Structure formats: structure tokens, C-alpha cells
Symmetry: D2
Subunit: 457 residues, 4 copies
Amino acid sequence: VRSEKDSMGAIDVPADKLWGAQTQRSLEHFRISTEKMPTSLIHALALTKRAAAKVNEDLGLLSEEKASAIRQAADEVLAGQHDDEFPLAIWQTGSGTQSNMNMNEVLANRASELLGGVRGMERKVHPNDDVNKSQSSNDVFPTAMHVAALLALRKQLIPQLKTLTQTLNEKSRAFADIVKIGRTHLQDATPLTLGQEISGWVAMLEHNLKHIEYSLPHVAELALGGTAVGTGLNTHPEYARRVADELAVITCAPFVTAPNKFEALATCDALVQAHGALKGLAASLMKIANDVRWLASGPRCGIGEISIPENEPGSSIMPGKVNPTQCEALTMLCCQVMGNDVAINMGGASGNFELNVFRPMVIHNFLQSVRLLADGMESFNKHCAVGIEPNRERINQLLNESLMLVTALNTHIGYDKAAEIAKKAHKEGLTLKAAALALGYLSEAEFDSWVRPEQMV
Amino acid sequence: VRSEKDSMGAIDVPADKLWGAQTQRSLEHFRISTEKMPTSLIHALALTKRAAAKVNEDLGLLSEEKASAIRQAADEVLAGQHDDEFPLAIWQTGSGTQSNMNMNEVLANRASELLGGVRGMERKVHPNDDVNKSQSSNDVFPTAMHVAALLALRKQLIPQLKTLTQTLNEKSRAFADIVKIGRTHLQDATPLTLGQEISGWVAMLEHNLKHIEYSLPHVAELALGGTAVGTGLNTHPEYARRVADELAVITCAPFVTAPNKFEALATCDALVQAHGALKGLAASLMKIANDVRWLASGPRCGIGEISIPENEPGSSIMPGKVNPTQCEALTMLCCQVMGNDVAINMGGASGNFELNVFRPMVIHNFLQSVRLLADGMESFNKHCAVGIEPNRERINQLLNESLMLVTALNTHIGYDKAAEIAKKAHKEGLTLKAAALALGYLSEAEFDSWVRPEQMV
Amino acid sequence: VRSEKDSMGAIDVPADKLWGAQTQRSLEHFRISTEKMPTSLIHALALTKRAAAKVNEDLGLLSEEKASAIRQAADEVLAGQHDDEFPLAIWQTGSGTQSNMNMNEVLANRASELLGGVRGMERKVHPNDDVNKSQSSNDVFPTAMHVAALLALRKQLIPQLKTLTQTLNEKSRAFADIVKIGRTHLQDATPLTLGQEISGWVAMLEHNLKHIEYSLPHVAELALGGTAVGTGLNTHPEYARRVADELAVITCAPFVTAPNKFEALATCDALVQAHGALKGLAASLMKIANDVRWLASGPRCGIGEISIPENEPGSSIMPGKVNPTQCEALTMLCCQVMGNDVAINMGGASGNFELNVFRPMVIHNFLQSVRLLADGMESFNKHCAVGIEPNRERINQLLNESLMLVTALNTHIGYDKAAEIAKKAHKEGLTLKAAALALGYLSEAEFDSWVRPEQMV
Amino acid sequence: VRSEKDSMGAIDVPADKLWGAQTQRSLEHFRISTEKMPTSLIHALALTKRAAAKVNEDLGLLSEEKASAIRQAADEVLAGQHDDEFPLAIWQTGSGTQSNMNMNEVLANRASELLGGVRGMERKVHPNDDVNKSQSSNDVFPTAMHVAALLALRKQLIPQLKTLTQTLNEKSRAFADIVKIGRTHLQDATPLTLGQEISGWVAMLEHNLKHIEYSLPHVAELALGGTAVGTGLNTHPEYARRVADELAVITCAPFVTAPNKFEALATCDALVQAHGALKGLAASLMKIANDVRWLASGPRCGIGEISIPENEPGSSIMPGKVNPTQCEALTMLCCQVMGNDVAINMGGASGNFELNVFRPMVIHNFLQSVRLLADGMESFNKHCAVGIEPNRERINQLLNESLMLVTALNTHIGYDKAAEIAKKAHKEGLTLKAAALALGYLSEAEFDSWVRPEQMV
């Protein structure tokens, strides 16, 4: 152990840990469930502390060595060597006060070691005085939240979306000439090509990308600089703009300071809205994933128009039986995003006065949705999408058995003659040709020259 | 017109209307959307005013004629002749104050006419003084809410549920001997009978009934008697128990006075919980309705194991094409109940101190869900369920084409021989028999005596 | 009555009605609940039939008189004289087939009367043959859905939003100089002006407008032209673009034909996404409405920093008691939009193959949300927002009683002296001045010159 | 490493791990997010494998040593020494096939070591042949799901609920004599005692317990015995009842075999319904937690009627400022449960035919809700509830400042005189007494003897 100290007194802290007293004490008051802060949030919080250090130094508010050590300590968190120094549960103070201190304490104890070498009360860097300089838990957590979200969106989900789109766009191109029977209300309908159907999946993904991109500008607005209530009391007038510019410099993302800090602190609106676009993508992905599994159902008693890769071990006595596992993982996580959206909306609508204190819950759900969506699309693409192949013989079989093509005959034989063979064929269990020949309305050769599915699109 | 008067002054009211000034004034302040109070709520509100009149009279708090006229006026509302006297939107005061007055005013003006004959300021019955005697908008609306819900549950939804159950139970009984191929993950699986599958739908409906019944006792608790904050200030000690007994006498439902009026006024918990059972039934109905439509998909390119009644006009050129319209109405309303549940939960969790003021919205959603569920099951039963018929030839065809029966051979020929024909059959596109015969492992007669689907359940 | 006839036969229809047989028959098969198509959807459906007539005529597909009469009949629906000719419930066929026919039949019977004069089987205009020419229930309903939504958004909700924003922006401007104590976690915090707080409400509304506007382009895409499965079988190549241009000409909205008809028919993605922006606005409105009611709570035992207009009749014995009725209507409808979003998401994710058959439910929820939001903001603005007034004396009282201003003393007397008076004041129940004077650290005059709330923002 | 082997071939597995090939391979196909199976599910899965072993042995289906070693290996999982042997993500095959195998493999390799000693291909116990004997992933996962849920409900959540109830019931008893002003619509209302208000919180918790208990019987029904599709093909007729009895013997819970295995496999109805009761408790907890934070707001500019324990370190310059941290953690997790309910409902309504394949997601949400609820109530009780204390002087102050007591004067001086002092007092900013004395209607002594808040309940 090691006795660390805060305004309430001294408390025992594991010697091999970098956190201080406040983190240790919160660890006892909030022993709820098992959800902790996500790594991406922790790194976004480190990035925030680093940019803040750099700006403070620029404004002569922090000495060269003090600032340089905090930033250097931050890079270690980013390097991933302090993942185990953040034990706090998601279910803490609604402002994310604890996790802010947790970062301040780990960064203070470590920056101290990077200078003199005291981890503990005799440290050279103060968590509150130096690490948390020109800030507040009120404006730091919201900033970390936006940094984590924008970056997760820009380099984790969007790349995977564009990738799924390209694979499906190529599959669409390759199967452009394969005509199949359409289905409306789950009933046989007018034919269309396999590529046309898949092109629908592609159009959907392109539309979604568009909707996700419109929600980025609002998420790119940072609260850092509004301090406690948004007035920005006790901070350099240039601090807000400066910290935003620095964060943008290092992340290469379009971060800007929020034009209205009161809106930035009082709400989680940017994320409520951004998640609206995500549940939209989940509804799209659910339909695409559903189409795939149904299209691949069988091998004998389903639809079986396409085949997908069999990734899980099977049985020799069970040839052709392939459970659509990737489709099941994607549909399941799509339900999660829908649920997460309700949690986010309830927390986002519950702000009071100057601050919204439902933040840890909101970012937990939001980050999880991006993670699920991005990884789900990656897994779906790699283990399923690239392997979509048409069962051409099965597709032809179905096409020739349906009555939906009887429309192509009308231009030669009126509705009367056409509807005649479709009635008998259906009653006797005959195909359009079989029935047409028996009713002597035309020959096989004429049938085969009149019913051209490739011409009815 | 007719100038009616309230504490804010006099206001013009349509001469041919029975409502007073307060209703007229609210009509101008809450012009939001088009949702009004449901007829069932209005009748439950009338029943409440009637029972209150009867108890007041019993406690010598209201004269024989005054009480008798209010009750007689109430019966007219119940008789359905005053449906047009309640113009108020759902989006009013969260306590349902307006609609309470709306009832007080219509019942005062009418009870007046049932005595002397003055509809207006010179009326013989006072809305507040006589009609709203020993009550408050705070405890009257919650009572009307519970009266409307319990009754809608007991004689509108439960009867329809039991009816759907019986139809499906009989269909289950009739198809007990029809063996079909099962489907897990949408892939062909081990066989089961059609009656067994349908018995699953029945077990689900019986379970749901059970869950709906457990939520009734809490909804049967009435708030009437707690007045403004639950203390029951200014009401006869026997009033609460007496009004509950009277309501139970006339509705034949097990109404009782709420043991804790503070919980009764501060929350909508009974309905939040009751609606939990309703969204449960919706998830069950959605699955049953989905099974039906998929099982009936076709006529040629789907599953087509069963046929359902064609209720909508079709085309001669489109024989066998039957859209599962009832399944589409039921699945759509099941989504609505899910949505309604979220609205209900948000309002139910938003109570503050002594009173929950999200009531008009809560009962609007709850009543709509019961209405949708009860009517949906009635329509589904009548126009679909009773008409479920098996396409026996299609079912056999699928059964004999699948490879899932190769298991029945193992008890004669080892896994090695069995898996051999299943591999070839699948590869060459042959049935188990066809492949088995070609591999000379057994004869057609032996195959037909070994693979008995009626014995593998 | 009047015997109308369809492919299933003849059926009795009320003589005084304009609808035909199919509408009459659906009226019996879908007797579910009481929700019917909203007037805005019906008018959007009429606008669609009108533009389709005009384009058909342009392509020599419909004679001058036939086309002119259908359009003229459509304008009557738009003029609002046929509101009672659409009895169909929302809970019908998922494609909205019935309501499409309902429009075809009313427009056929009426256009007939506008020519010769036969309402019924001997009519001069055929619902299917002339009214439903070059269309399908599959592509007509989705078009009507988008027409109704975009127009409701552009001229019903956005105008009300901008209006609420301007009122609040002016209230913000007027109270810019009124300093009040801030509240974080519901605890007293650093001060800010009333105008700054309200400016937060304004920034939120401006952001929302921005988010709603980004969702319009996708909703402006029309499916009309894709026919049954999206291939656009049996329609003039120029039909799609032409009908879109015409609809844009008459509505003055930026309608365009959907680049991908398969996405347009297979999903309700545009509305799932658009509603995402609406639930975002509801979360914002809920917070603003909550701030108002809490800020106006009292008159004696709450916060009471502002007063709002008393629109409902009160009691002389209850002076100052004003229930925040508008805030209760707005918060209630905000919960509804949240619920509606879940219904919309479930239906939007349930599309199968070529068509989504959850449409009537989706547009019912979407249209209701716009209606609730637009009307709610109108009612809130008019009956509450414009009347927001600060209780300046109450605000000063609270400001001078709080300990939050002790920070302003530090620049004269160190933390030691400052924290001393804040400790005693809190313990003894004294103000900062009262305690400061007793501890002889400074004079009243010095206190009154050092603690300037107007300088700590 | 160590080369393990399955039907797809051999694969490299970490030598220091107990899992086999299938687990290793799934680990690569389902790299989605970071959610893994909860410890409680894993232990419920171990309990299932143990009871299955014991029954197999009883039916002479598994040798003494084979059975004894599997059970002994299971107890080690229960002892918590194999927590790190289950790497699988929640986002896997919808039936939970992988995690079932993951358990089979770890239990096979370990039971082998408990006999001869071969961890790997030359092991003495076969995962599929011995560990997964008389079972299927289809009926084993649903059983583990119900075992985990019932036990978490019975010994984790209910105990915490009853504990919170008792604390609040005692606080209610202790403050029974403390009269305070009520609040309806957030406006001052008729008075009630603090104990009466808190008794409302208690009544709510007692009601919830009741609702949670009604959902247990359905969750106590186990699917184990229905095998693949529910027919129970290839299992001892007594197997189902026997395994249920054994599980009940060891867990001491009322487990029984599901009367209908088709309903048990095709749906997650029991959990959809059980979670309905949980979101009900969350709406109740949200209100209680909200009442507390608002009641404790201040120290100067809020309500401040009660004080709560300050558990987080503060500032000397900030005396009396105590953020309601426990209330913020509880309200946040209540939003989560609401969200989780939507995820659960969507998955529960998406079952197809013989099996629901949304199970891993459903149990993940359900288990998390119980965990959050149970731990939240424990933390809230311990760190907040037991410390609720009334600010008696603040409560009196508010009581004497309000106009709500003017009603008590009417029985001496008519409405005219009473409403007179309430009007002036409100206008001049005087209390009822102050105004009453100035208007010479009565003396201070008479006022102090007529306005008795302890008598108006």
C-alpha cells in the first residue's frame, strides 16, 4: 500500500498503482456492476489532458518541465501502458468527476516520476493544481466524450462502412445479369436481377454514410473552456480556442470550440443526434443481414438462392447445412444499438439547469454502438459478404416454376389466353409452359421465345 | 353561444353544448394535434362521478335529487349519447384536470336539465360544488385511469386472447399427425408435427394470459380518497372504501381502495407494470404472426407449407398469390405496443414529489395498446387463424427432399454408410433414397421401411 | 346503398359515399382500433394522384378530359371537401394498398360525376385503369409518405421552431444583465446571467434546426416510378423524373426521383433517419420545458426565479399558485416522440426483400411526431415562452444568501480568511457579509465593493 | 501452443488453456467489441453440465468415473478458478452454440486431467460425446439462461430490494411526526408528513417485489430435454424431469421442466416478461432517487428539506455543497434498464420457427439489468438511504412562509376574510400571520392556535 491524501483525509492505496486517494475512495463508493470506462474514452481523456498541458505552457501558466512531463505521461496512456490504472465503474458521478480525477492522479504520480521520482504525497506534480489546471470535471468530461466519439466515427466506423459498401457494390456488379423472382409481402412477385437487389443494399449504405457525416460537425464542437457553468470563469480568454486548435493538430480531426458553452455543458444533444444516425444504420444493417440469411436458407427446405461461407465446424452427416452465424451476430448487435438509443435519449432529455449529469451512461452506450457497428461490419464483410455466391441452378428452377412470368405472354395472346394457362397450371400444379402446351395455345419453341425474364428486368 | 363563467371571468360557449367555461377555455390553450380522450376513459370517468355521487348521498353529503340527477346524467354518457361533449386533447395538464372539469361541467348542465332545466350559469347543479364533491383532479383522474384499464383488460383483451388460444389449440389438435421438417437458424432441421409447432403458439398465449392476470390486482387499486396529496384531507373517513365498493358493485370488477394513496398519486407504477405484460404479448404475437406469413409464402418461390384465407380482391392472372394482410396488421400494431411501452416508461419514471403529471399521455398509450391487441387478435382469429390449412403435398415434398432424415438409417447402416449417401445426394442433387439406391447400400423397400418420419417425432 | 363491384364480386356501399367496393370490403376486414390515415397523408396521396394524372396526359397516356377530371377531383380533396370519404384504419395491409385504392375509387367516382355523372359501376373513370395508371400500391404509398413528411417538415414544424427560437432569443437579450446563481448537480454553483442560460436554450434550438435540415434531402427522394419491385416495369422511361418534377412544381418543395428505387421500396430509411432528428429535438425541448417549470416553481417553497403566464382559472384563496400546464403538455408529447421512434425503428428494420410492409404504422408515428412537435412549440411559445418574466427580487435574495460568492474575496483576503467566513456563515446560518463582518475581516462597504456578481459572469 | 482438432481440421491453441479447437476458431470469427459472457451465465452453464452429468450417470448413460470427473471439473468453474477459460464474445451464434462448446471443451480437457491427465486430442473425456451427452446447444443455452436469471433474481436483486425497503420503512417511521409542505405540479400544495411521503417510496418497493415474484414461475421452467426442435429426440424419457429435479436440488430454487419445449425453444418470452417487471422497478427507483436529490438540493438556493451523506472529497471554501452522487448513479442505471428492455423486446419478438437465435444478446441485457439494479440499490442504501436526515428548521421555515395553510382559518373566519390575508400576504410579501395581524382579523395567539399543520395531515 501507500497512504495518499485528499480533502477528506488519507487513505490506503495499492503501492503498485499510479492513482491517488480520490480514485481509491470512489472505488469503494461506486461498486456497481462490471462496466468500466472504455479504452477509447480513457485515451480521449489523456489527449485532452495533453492538449491542455501544451496550451497552459503556451500561456505561461505551466513551466516547461511540468508541462512536458504531463504530456509525456499522457503519451504513455496513449501508448497503452496504463490500461490497468483506471478501475472506475461507469456508474459514478453523472459529470464524470471521478474519472477526471482518476486521470489527474495517474498523470500526476507518473509525471512526477518522469522528473524527480515521487509517486505519492511528496510528488512533484499536483493532480488538481497542475494536471487539472484551467479546467473542471464539468467541461473536461464533455470534451473527452466528443473527442472519443468523433475519432471513433472517423477512423473506426466510417472506414468499415465504406469497405462493406465496396464489397457489396462489386458483388452487385458481378451478378447484374442473374435474373431472379422478386418478393413483395413474402409472395412471388415480378422478377429483378440479383445485382439490382444487392444494389439496394449498397444504396442504403451510401445513404447512411451521408447521414453519419452530417452529424459530425456538431460532435466536433468541444466544451473545454466553459469551466463550471459555461461562463469560462478563471481561464485565459484564448484558452478555449487554443485547446481546440491543439486537439485538432494532434488528432487531425476538425475540432473547434463550441460557440455556446451553455448548450455544450447543459446537454448531450450532439450525441443524441449522432446516435440517431447510428440507429438508422442498424435498421439498414438488420434488413441486409436478414435478406442474406433468408436468401441462403436451406439447403433443401428454404429459399436457397445464394450460398455463404461456412465458418463453423459441421458434420459429414449434415452436408449443406450452414447456419448464418455472421448474420446472427449482426442482427443481435443491431437490436443492441436500438436499445442503446433509448438509454441515450432518456439521459439526454434529463439535463437540469447548467449541467447534464447522465454523461458516463451516455458515452458508454454511444461508444459501444460505434464499436459494435464498426466491428460487426468488419466481421460480416470478411466472414460473409465477400463470400456471397448465387446458386444459379436453384435460382432458375424457382424462376421457371413461378406463375409471375405469365405477363410476358399477353403481348401475343390476350389476357384471356394468358390467365387461362396460369389458372390451370396453378390448379394442376403445372408450369406456365407445361400448362400452355396442354391447352394448345402455343408451342414450346414459341413459349421459350416469348417468356424472356431477361427482358422484363 | 352562451356565456358561461369561471374564476377568470365569463366566456362564450356553443349554445348546443353541455360543457362549461373551463372546458371552453382549455380548448383554446391546448390546441395540440388531434388526439382526444378515448371513449373508454370518458366512460370510466362517468362511472367514477356516478359512484362518487351515490356515496356522497349515502353519507348525507348530497341531497337525493342532486345525487340522482348526476347519476342519471352519467348513465347517459355511458349510454353513449354525449360522446361529442368532450373536445379536449390528450395533451393538456398532466394531472388530467381539464378533462375532470369537462366531465363536471357536462354532468352539471345536464343534471340541471334533468331537474329544473337550466343549462348554464343559472343551472341547479354546480360542477365543482356538487359534481366534484369530496374529490380532486389529482385523485379522480388516476381512479378513472385504473377503472378504464382493468375493464378493458377484463372484458376486451382477455376474452379475445382466450378465443385465439382455443382456435389455435384446435388447429393444433387437427394437425397433430402431420409431420414436417423443423427449422433452426432458418436451416432444415429435425422433423416435428405441424400440431407440435402450433402447440408452441398455444403455450405462448396461455403463458401470456397468466402474466396479464398477475398485473390486475395492482391496477384494481383506486386512488379516489387521497384527494390532493394523498392525506385525504376533507373527505369522509369511509369515503375511500365506500366509493371503491360501489365501483366494484356496478362494474363487477374487484376494485379496492389503494392501501397507500401516496404511491397511488405519485406514480403510474401499476400501469407501467401492466404494460410490461402487454409488450410481452406483443413479442409473442409478432413471432406467431411471422411464422404464419413465412409458412404461407409462395405460392411457388417460398415455403408454402400452409395456406391462409384470401380476403382481399385479386387477379385471375395471379392465381395463388395471397398477401398475408392480417399478419401485416398484427405485426405493425405489435411494433406500436413496443413503442407505446417506452412512452409509458418515460412518463412513469418522471413523477415528482406528491403527483405524477404525465397521466393523460400514459393512459392514451396504455388504452391504445389494449385496443390494438384485443382488436388485432379478433381480426387475426376471424380472418386468418380459423382458416389455417396445411398444404399436405407441399409438406411431403419438402420432407422427402431434405437430408435431415439420414439419421434414421444409422440404426441399420453405420454412420459411414449413412453419411455416404447424404454426401453424394447433396453433391449430385439426389434425395436420400435416390442416392442410397445408386450406392447399392439398400433397396427402395428397405429405405421406405427404415426412414419413418412419423417415428422421429 | 349502391352495389359496387370488384374481382371478388359485388358488395353494398353507402349510396352517399364516393368510395368503391375494395374500400368497403377492407372496412370489414380491418376493424382495428380507431386510428385512421391522417389528413396530411390523404392530401399527399391526392397530390400524388394529381401529378400522376398530369404526367400521364403529357405522355399521351390519358385523354384530356379523363386527366382533367381526376386532377379537378383531387383538388376537391385538397380543398378539404372529401375528408369523410376515407374510413380506412391505419392497421391495414403493410404496403398501404387499401388506402391507395380508397383514393383511386373516390377519385374515379367523383371524376366521373365531373364529366357524365355516374357514381358507381357505370362510372366514366376507372379507379385502376385510369386513376391508378402507370402506378402500383408499392410505389404510390411510399411517394405519398415522403410528400406528406417533407411538406409537414418544411411548412409546419420548421416555422414553429424558428418562431420559438426568436422569442427565446429576445428574452435572452432582455435578461442579459440579470445575474443569477448557477446550478450543477442541482447544487448551488457559480453565477451566470439569466440571458446566458436562456441563450443555451436558443443555441439548442438552432442546432436542432440544423439537424432537421440535413435529413430533408433523403426524404425529398420519391419512389414513384419503380412500380412493383423497383425495376419500373411498364412505365414510360420519363415517367419517374416527370412525376417528381410536377410534384415539385406544385408543392414548391425540392422533390426529386429516387436514384435507387430498390432502396426506396425496400426500406423506410429516410424516415427512420429523419425521425432520429425529431427525437433529438424532443430531448432538447424536454430539458427546456423542465428548466422553465422548475425555475417557476413555488410561489414560496420552490425556486421561483421566473414567473410564467397563468392561463387556467384559479382560486382567490390560492394567490400565486400557477401550474406550469404548457410545460406539462410539452414534456408529455416529448415522451410520445421517444416512444414513436422505437415503433418507427422496429418497422424500418423489418423490411423483407423487395418491399417494406410496415409503412402505414411508420407514417402514422412520423406524422404524429411532427404534428405534436409543431403544435407543441406553437402552444408553448404563445401561451408560455413570450410571457417569461424574472422575479428580480427573488433572484437577488437567492444570490445574496448563497456561499458561492466567497470566491470573489480571495483576491483581497487569502483562501484562509475567505474559507473562514464561508464555514462560519454556513454553520451559524449567516450570509457571507454577516459572517465576514462578525469575524471583523472587513467592513460592509468593503464587502459590497469586493463581491460583485456582475463581474464573475 | 497445442494443436487441437475438430471436424474442420486441426488448429493451434494456447498450451496453457483448457479450451479446444471450436472455441479457438470462434475466437477468430467473432472478434466483435469487448462484451463477453457474464460470470453468472458461465456458472449457470457449469451447473447445467454438472446436473446433466449426474443424471446421465443415473440412467447408466455415463460411467462413474467419467461423470464424477466432469462434475468435479464443473465445481472448479463454480469455485471460480477457470474464469479465464471463456474468451468468447456475446456477439456469436444466436443459439449460444460456441459458448456451449467452450464449456464442453474446458470441462473435457480438465476432467481428463482429473483422471489420466491428457489435455488435448488424447484426452480421456470427449466434449461432444461425454460432456455434451443427451443435449444440444439449442436446449442447453436456454437452460443456462433461466438458471442464471432465476438465481440472480432470488439471491441478488430481491435481497437488496427488501433491504432498501426496510431502511426506508424505518426512516418513514422516524419522521412520521415531521410535517412538510406537499408539492403537486412542482407548486406548493397541501401539507403532509415526511414519513408519509417516504411511506410512498416504501409502498412502491413492496409493490415491485410483488411484481418481480410473479415473473419467477415462468423463468423457473427449463428447456433442457427438448433437444434440437423440442421433440426431445434421442434422450431418456425421464431425462428432462430428472435434470430439472437435480438442478433444483443443488440450487435450492424451484426449477421444473418446461411443459411445452416448443415454446421454451422458440421464444425468450419468460425473460421478456421478467424484464417487464424490472423496467417497472427502474421507473420506481428513478422517481425515488429524483425525490431525494431534489429534496436535498442547495445548500441555499434549492429546496434543502433533507440532507444526505457527503461521500466524495470537497472543499473548505465550499461548505454544505454536496453533490447527490448516489442518486446520479442510480438514475443513470435506471435509464440503462429502460434501454436494455427495448433490446430484449426486439430480440424476443424475432424468433423464427423452432428456435430463437437472439439469445446471447437477450441474456446479456437481462443479466446486466439485475446486476445494475441489485448493486445500485445496495450502493444507494449503504451510501445514501441510511443517512437521510431532515433539515427541521428549513422545513419549518418553508411551512410558515407558504400560503397553503390559509385553509385552516376558514372554520373561524369565512372564505372572504381568509382569502383576504392570502391575497395581501402574497402581494406585499408577508406570511399568513403577518398579513392577518395587519388586517386586524385576529391576533398572533389566535393565529398560532388556529393554523395547526399537524392537524391538516
